[PDB]
Amino acid sequence: DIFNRDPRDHYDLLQRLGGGTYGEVFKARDKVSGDLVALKMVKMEPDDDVSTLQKEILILKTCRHANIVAYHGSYLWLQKLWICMEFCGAGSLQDIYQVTGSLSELQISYVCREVLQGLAYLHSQKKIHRDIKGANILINDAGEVRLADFGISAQIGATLARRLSFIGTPYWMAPEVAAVALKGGYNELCDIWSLGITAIELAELQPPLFDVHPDRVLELMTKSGYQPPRLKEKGKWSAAFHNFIKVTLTKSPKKRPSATKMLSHQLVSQPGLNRGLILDLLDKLKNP
Amino acid sequence: DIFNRDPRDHYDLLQRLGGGTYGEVFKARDKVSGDLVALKMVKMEPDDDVSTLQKEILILKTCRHANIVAYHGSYLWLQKLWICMEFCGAGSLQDIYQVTGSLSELQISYVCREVLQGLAYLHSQKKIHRDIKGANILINDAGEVRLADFFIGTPYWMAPEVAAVALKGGYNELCDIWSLGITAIELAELQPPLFDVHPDRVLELMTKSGYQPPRLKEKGKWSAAFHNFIKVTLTKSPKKRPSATKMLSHQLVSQPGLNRGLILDLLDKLKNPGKGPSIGDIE
Ligand SMILES: CC1(C)OC(=O)c2ccc(Nc3ncc(-c4nnco4)c(N[C@H](CO)c4ccccc4)n3)cc21
Numbered sequence: 001d002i003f004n005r006d007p008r009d010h011y012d013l014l015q016r017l018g019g020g021t022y023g024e025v026f027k028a029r030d031k032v033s034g035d036l037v038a039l040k041m042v043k044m045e046p047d048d049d050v051s052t053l054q055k056e057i058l059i060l061k062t063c064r065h066a067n068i069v070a071y072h073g074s075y076l077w078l079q080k081l082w083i084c085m086e087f088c089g090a091g092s093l094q095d096i097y098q099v100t101g102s103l104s105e106l107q108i109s110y111v112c113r114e115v116l117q118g119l120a121y122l123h124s125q126k127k128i129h130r131d132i133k134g135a136n137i138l139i140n141d142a143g144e145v146r147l148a149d150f151g152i153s154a155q156i157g158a159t160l161a162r163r164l165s166f167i168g169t170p171y172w173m174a175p176e177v178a179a180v181a182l183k184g185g186y187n188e189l190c191d192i193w194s195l196g197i198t199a200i201e202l203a204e205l206q207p208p209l210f211d212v213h214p215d216r217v218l219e220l221m222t223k224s225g226y227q228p229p230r231l232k233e234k235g236k237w238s239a240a241f242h243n244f245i246k247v248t249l250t251k252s253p254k255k256r257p258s259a260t261k262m263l264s265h266q267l268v269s270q271p272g273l274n275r276g277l278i279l280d281l282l283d284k285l286k287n288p
Numbered sequence: 289d290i291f292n293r294d295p296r297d298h299y300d301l302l303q304r305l306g307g308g309t310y311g312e313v314f315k316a317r318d319k320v321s322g323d324l325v326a327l328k329m330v331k332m333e334p335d336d337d338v339s340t341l342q343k344e345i346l347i348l349k350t351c352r353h354a355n356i357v358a359y360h361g362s363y364l365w366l367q368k369l370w371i372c373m374e375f376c377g378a379g380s381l382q383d384i385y386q387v388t389g390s391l392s393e394l395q396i397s398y399v400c401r402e403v404l405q406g407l408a409y410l411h412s413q414k415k416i417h418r419d420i421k422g423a424n425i426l427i428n429d430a431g432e433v434r435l436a437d438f439f440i441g442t443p444y445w446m447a448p449e450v451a452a453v454a455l456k457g458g459y460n461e462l463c464d465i466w467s468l469g470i471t472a473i474e475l476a477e478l479q480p481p482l483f484d485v486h487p488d489r490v491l492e493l494m495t496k497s498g499y500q501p502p503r504l505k506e507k508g509k510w511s512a513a514f515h516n517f518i519k520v521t522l523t524k525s526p527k528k529r530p531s532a533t534k535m536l537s538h539q540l541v542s543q544p545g546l547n548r549g550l551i552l553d554l555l556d557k558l559k560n561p562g563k564g565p566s567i568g569d570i571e
Pocket residue numbers: 017018019025038040069085086087088089090091092095138148149150
């Protein structure tokens with residue numbers, strides 16, 4: 001499927017959006033159609049075990065949904081893997097709230113509905129995002145919401161398949177060992193919890209315990225008496241938003257509702273939720 | 289790792305005991321002492337030899353207990369790693385029950401006590417066997433029982449079950465207690481439960497919400513102590529499952545009359561199932 005041609009043949013590079021250890025990301029325009037796309041250039045040549053890049057592109061190609069970042073194709077030219085994906089002009093919700101500040105309850109309910117639609121699709125295809133957060137929710141110039149960055153789920157998928165699933169007989173394995181061998185010890189409902197933390201992150205600019213050291217947070221959550229977090233200010237939010245947080249953050253995965261069940265909740269089912277709510281957020285981003 | 293010499297200098301190879309992905313295992317005799325050993329020849333595969341050779345052999349040497357199979361040394365000659373270990377004459381309990389048939393409750397109870405002693409030692413050294421089964425419990429010619437054959441993300445958005453797997457790994461040493469319980473059923477019925485079900489279908493059944501721990505098929509054949517030992521070792525919840533030292537106080541393994549003699553009686557049935565001479569005239 002991968003094009004073994006130079007990406008500069010089909011697209012014009014405009015500017016560097018970001019980068020890091022994995023690869024640089026660029027804004028680019030299609031030569032024929034003029035439509036914008038993002039190109040993630042990954043340095044791929046002497047790197048061992050490229051099953052992570054292989055599973056990420058596979059996840060992207062098979063995902064066809066409005067609330068999942070669209071995938072256009074891939075290129076291999078001069079030992080660099082350029083992944084062509086949907087351009088989302090306003091960047092991530094994190095990039096936005098760092099300038100605009102706290103989102104409104106209706107703007108958060110629109111984002112939650114759009115993420116839940118994307119999660120119900122991923123879960124129906126037997127996929128787990130495993131990294132739902134403001135930084136992985138992209139917003140385009142039309143105010144549309146997209147789930148992005150399946151890099152964590154690709155690292156987990158590649159590990160729990162060949163690198164950690166070359167084991168014989170399950171007959172003597174305890175049920176907790178069987179769960180790790182088959183799934184990794186958890187199910188798609190971990191994304192529902194992460195959405196609940198993301199809803200707090202949009203309301204308060206931080207997830208709960210963000211000031212606590214990451215090693216200390218792992219221990220608190222694993223302690224027997226761990227209480228799920230709640231919204232700091234009570235009066236500022238309606239009873240529907242407090243109940244959405246309460247149900248998405250159910251400690252027990254067996255009792256936590258699914259993505260399709262969460263779409264019937266009042267906060268998410270109310271009328272008046274549309275991309276206009278996020279265009280109002282982007283006007284605050286554009287005008288000081 | 290320890291000796292960079294050819295193993296044929298110190299031992300005489302006699303026959304191939306077995307093999308597979310885990311290399312080739314041979315029977316061998318010491319040239320000076322005449323004592324028998326088992327040599328596991330592993331094909332090295334060029335990748336790493338800083339920790340993969342020095343630290344791995346250091347762990348193997350520092351596992352010193354009566355119920356863990358003994359380690360003698362290692363060799364690196366012609367890109368092959370020969371691990372010299374105790375020759376356990378009678379082989380594994382699987383090799384034995386395939387000839388003798390079902391073990392008795394007292395013989396199973398003895399094996400369980402010896403495996404529990406080996407597990408309490410491994411767990412105290414912060415090690416997990418992870419593969420307790422009849423094929424990995426070796427019996428030597430003296431009737432002794434020896435165990436053998438040894439973060440992604442930021443946490444603020446992780447669910448508590450994801451945090452538990454990231455911090456504590458998804459499972460602990462108590463997985464060995466469950467496996468011992470399955471092994472006790474295996475020694476009694478010649479198979480672990482669900483052995484006829486496809487392995488892919490078994491992973492799904494165990495992971496399903498309503499998975500019920502297995503039990504002994506014949507009830508009357510076994511005492512209430514053996515049924516309770518199975519019940520208690522096969523506790524679905526790892527938080528409620530007892531430790532190896534706690535299991536040593538159980539009625540089944542604490543009862544009197546448990547001794548090496550029970551295993552010596554099992555090796556006699558293995559040696560004497562054949563018929564005597566009838567047509568051999570000779571003189
Ligand atoms: C790489 C990633 C996240 O993984 C995918 O699966 C994916 C799909 C489509 C993507 N498209 C896209 N389009 C435009 C912008 C933008 N436009 N203005 C600012 O940013 C943007 N920003 C993100 C968030 O800052 C970004 C993240 C990291 C480095 C650079 C940018 N991302 C981006 C991605």
